């Protein structure tokens, strides 16, 4: 995978150039916002179970998907769904903490849409759950940290669609 630092290094590596005056400023932008990223990660780690709980109750619960015939129906498929929200929340935190969505492309979104369309999982319902967590996470981490997380929340939703 890549992060904000190594992504800039690889960009200069392919060109065969040293770290430019513009390239140094991109790193300084990441270092200056380093403590803000770490502060948000600790809050989400503490409220990991609560963010997923509120997101499911807001968007998913009390609807056709939870009822017989729906995809969330049965304890196996219900437990399998909240497990995905636990991944999406955890992998979104890595993308924010790293400052690069390379981890989402490799270890999450790679062949994810094809796996759902095969099994029969609704993508539209999954997006609403992730978008629900974006609003719930933003209230806890704040406006500054909430926006940065939202970039990688929307990146996961973009990969599914």
């Amino acid at each position: 995978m890549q992060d904000a630092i190594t992504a800039v290094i690889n960009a200069s590596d392919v060109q065969g150039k040293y770290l430019d005056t513009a390239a140094m400023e991109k790193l300084k932008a990441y270092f200056a916002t380093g403590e803000l990223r770490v502060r948000a990660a600790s809050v989400i780690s503490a409220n990991a179970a609560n963010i997923v709980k509120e997101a499911v109750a807001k968007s998913l619960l009390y609807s056709d998907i939870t009822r017989p015939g729906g995809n969330m129906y049965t304890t196996r498929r219900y437990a399998a769904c909240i497990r995905d929200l636990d991944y999406y929340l955890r992998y979104a935190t890595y993308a924010m903490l790293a400052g690069d969505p390379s981890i989402l492309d490799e270890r999450v979104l790679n062949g994810l849409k094809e796996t759902y369309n095969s099994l029969g999982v609704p993508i539209a319902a999954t997006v609403q759950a992730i978008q629900a967590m974006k609003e719930v996470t933003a209230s806890l981490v704040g406006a500054d940290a909430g926006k940065e997380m939202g970039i990688y929340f929307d990146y996961i939703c973009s990969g599914l669609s």
Partner: protein, 160 residues
């Protein structure tokens, strides 16, 4: 970087980053400004480091630039100074990254397979980066020379 390593280890065990691992990112971002100044100092004094390191390298190993050697001639000697420039450019990435992964992935993984095929003496290449270490560290301060030197030592050890 330490941020990448902390995420990879955390993802392996299926868990959020621990308070200790988050602290390794906290000090990393605070000491990031220090390492950028070290990277710039080597970048500004790039041409001088390569020239002096070459002069010292060929003094200690004249056989490479003598008839029969690998770096015999103007073009072959100039190509050797480029190799030094490459590893100096990799060292600056290693410094700013906070670890030797950028140096490892690019110019060290399968490095002996390259030079053995080319017919270049790798202990001579290791002696070349020893010259860069001493010339590069002399420009930096006492504290910075100790930090930057550890990345040079890694490149020396990988070749040996």
């Amino acid at each position: 970087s330490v941020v990448t390593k902390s995420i990879v280890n955390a993802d392996a065990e299926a868990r959020y980053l621990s308070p200790g691992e988050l602290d390794r990112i906290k000090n990393f971002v605070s000491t990031g400004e220090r390492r950028l100044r070290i990277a710039q100092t080597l970048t500004e004094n790039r041409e001088r480091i390569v020239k002096q390191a070459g002069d010292q390298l060929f003094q200690k190993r004249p056989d490479v630039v003598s008839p029969g050697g690998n770096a015999y001639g103007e073009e072959m000697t100039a190509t050797c100074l480029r190799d030094l420039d490459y590893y100096l450019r990799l060292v600056t990435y290693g410094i700013v990254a906070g670890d030797v992964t950028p140096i490892e992935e690019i110019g060290l993984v399968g490095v002996r397979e390259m030079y053995n095929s080319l017919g270049t003496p790798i202990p001579a290449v290791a002696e070349g980066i020893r010259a860069m270490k001493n010339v590069a560290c002399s420009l930096l301060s006492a504290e910075d020379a100790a930090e930057a030197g550890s990345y040079f030592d890694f490149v020396i050890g990988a070749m040996q």
